[PDB]
Amino acid sequence: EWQENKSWNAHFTEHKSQGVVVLWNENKQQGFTNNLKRANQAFLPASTFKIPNSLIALDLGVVKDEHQVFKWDGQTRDIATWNRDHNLITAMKYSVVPVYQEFARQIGEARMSKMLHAFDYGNEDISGNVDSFWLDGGIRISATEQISFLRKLYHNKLHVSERSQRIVKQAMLTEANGDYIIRAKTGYSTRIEPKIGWWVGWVELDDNVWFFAMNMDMPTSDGLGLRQAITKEVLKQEKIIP
């Protein structure tokens, strides 16, 4: 059911980095990774938590639909794309933290915890501030647990409405062409060591789906582009994409 392919470590050592890539072949129900131990090591989810947060906000009515505008609060932050109006799509696209902090505040501690247990999401611990626990609180999730969660989302099997899950899968849309479709979400954890970058999602093919989850040490923001690059080099190597 699982197999270790240490040849993939070259794609990390190539960039003087360390990390894990996990792949799941849905048709064959088989998983692959370069590091079985780190595949099961749990980190802060950071902005990958915007997936479950979106689901809960939509299913509870905090977010009515993907067109609803959440206006900038006027406070200039260091990321330009954050200093503007957003909807669910663009807030996901640009990982707009302050938007999702407002979602969390309206969701509330009680309902947030209840839902993460229903999702079987990571360690299901929201200890900390309700509006930042996924950045510096107690919540933890591993690469293999991300994929477990994503597979439930793909099959509309999470304990929320089908509508909520379809909308979030739309918001996750990252890349599409004649060969494949990628729905995914990035993450960047900096407040607690080790600093890491995330990329979790799946690749849709004509007749199969490849789920993926990766994280890697990220001492500086300069290497954030390696999250997608390393993943795509593994996919290319495995002939999942040209």
The contact set with Cl ion (CB under 5 A) reads 170, 173
Task: Could you list the residues known to form a binding site, using ranges.
Answer: 47, 50, 95, 227
Residue 60 interacting entry, from Cl ion, ligand M8Q, none, C-beta within 5 to 8 Å by type: none
Answer yes or no: are the C-beta atoms of 129 and 137 closer than 8 Å: yes
Task: Could you list the residues known to form a binding site for a beta-lactam, using ranges.
Answer: 47, 50, 95, 227
CA distance 213 to 35: 12
Assess 79 for contact with ligand M8Q (CB under 6 A). yes
Smallest gap, in angstroms, from Cβ of residue 170 to Cl ion? 4
Which of the residues 158 through 217 are near ligand M8Q (CB under 6 A)?
186, 188, 190
Assess 221 for contact with ligand M8Q (CB under 6 A). yes
Residue 170 interacting entry, from ligand M8Q, Cl ion, none, C-beta within 5 to 8 Å by type: Cl ion
CB nearer to ligand M8Q: give 94 or 180: 94
User: What does R_g of the chain's alpha carbons equal in angstroms?
Assistant: 17
Interface with ligand M8Q (CB under 6 A), residue total 10
Residues that are catalytic: 47
CA distance 194 to 44: 10
Which of the residues 100 through 129 are near ligand M8Q (CB under 6 A)?
none
CB nearer to ligand M8Q: give 26 or 223: 223
| DSSP state, residue 118 | H
Q: Counting Cβ atoms within 10 Å, is residue 171 exposed (0-12), middle (13-18) or buried (19+)? A: buried
CA distance 34 to 168: 29
> Edge-to-edge strand order for the sheet containing 181-189?
2-4, 30-33, 19-25, 208-217, 196-205, 181-189, 173-176
CB nearer to Cl ion: give 89 or 173: 173
Interacting residue with ligand M8Q among 60, 224, 229, 241 (CB under 6 A): 224
Contact characters 6-45, ligand M8Q, x per CB under 6 A: ----------------------------------------
Cβ partners under 8 Å of residue 61, min gap 6:
none
194 cis-preceded (ω within 30 degrees of 0): yes
Cβ partners under 8 Å of residue 239, min gap 6:
none
Tokens standing for 47? 């902005």
- Can you give the binding site for ligand M8Q, defined by CB under 6 A? 79, 94-95, 97, 135, 186, 188, 190, 221, 224
